[PDB]
Symmetry: D2
Subunit: 74 residues, 4 copies
C-alpha cells in the first residue's frame, strides 16, 4: 500500500500545484484588465502589498524612512 | 474611477486569498507525509523532477556524474 | 582521467574561491548593519534607504506620487 | 545633526562601498561562468556541482538513494 500511497501524495501535490497556477493566471488576468483601464500595474501591485500591512506601522516606518533619507540624501 | 480601482483591488485580493489557501493545503500535505515517515526534502525533489523531460534529466545527471567524479570534494 | 580532473578542478576551485570572497564581503556588510543597530538605527529602514538610493530619484518621485493617489482612492482592505 | 545625521552618512557610505566590492566579485563569478560556457562546459551542471560540494557527501549519498527508491515507487 506504500507505493500507491506515495503516488497519491505526489499526485495530490501536483494537482494543488496546477490549481495554484490557475489562480496565478486569474490574478494576471485582472492585472491585464487594470492595465487596459489605464492603471499603472507596477504601482497597483505595490498597493496590494501595502494593504496587507497595518496602516499605523506603515505610517511610522515611512516617517522614519523619510527621516533617514533626509539625513543622507536620496 | 475610485470604485473601478477598488473593485480591481478587491478582486485581486480575493484571488490571492484563494491562492494562499492552496499554498497552505500544499504545506499541509507535506506535513502529513512527514508524519507518515516520508522524506519531505526528497518528495519535493520528486515533484521537481517529474516536471522535466526524462531524457534531458538523464543527460544532465550523466554529465553531473562525470563532473562530480572528476573534481571530488 | 588526468585532463578531466585538472580542468574541472581548477574551474571549480576558482569559483569557490570567489564565492568565499563574496561571503566575506557579505559578512562585512552585516557587521556594519550590526554597528548601525548598536548606534540606535533601525536596520530594516536602513536597508530600504540603501535600496532607494540605488534607483532614479525622479522615477521614484513619480511612482510614489501615483501610489499615494491610488491608496487614497481605494483605502484599506477589510 | 552630527550625531543623528552624520553618523548615518558614514554608515551609508561604508555599506555602499562594500556593496560595490560585492558587486565586483559577483561580476567576476559571472565572467568565469561565461568563460567556461564559451569553452564547452555545462554551466548549469557546474553550478550544481558547486552547490553539492557545500553539502556533506554522505548526506547526499543517502538522499540520492532515497530519491531513487521514491522514483521507482511512483513508477517514474
Amino acid at each position: 500500500v506504500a507505493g500507491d500511497q506515495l503516488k497519491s501524495i505526489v499526485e495530490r501535490i501536483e494537482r494543488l500545484e496546477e490549481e495554484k497556477k490557475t489562480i496565478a493566471d486569474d490574478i494576471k488576468e485582472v492585472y491585464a484588465e487594470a492595465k487596459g483601464n489605464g492603471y499603472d500595474v507596477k504601482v497597483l501591485r505595490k498597493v496590494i502589498a501595502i494593504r496587507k500591512r497595518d496602516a499605523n506601522e506603515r505610517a511610522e516606518e515611512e516617517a522614519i524612512l523619510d527621516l533617514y533619507l533626509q539625513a543622507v540624501g536620496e
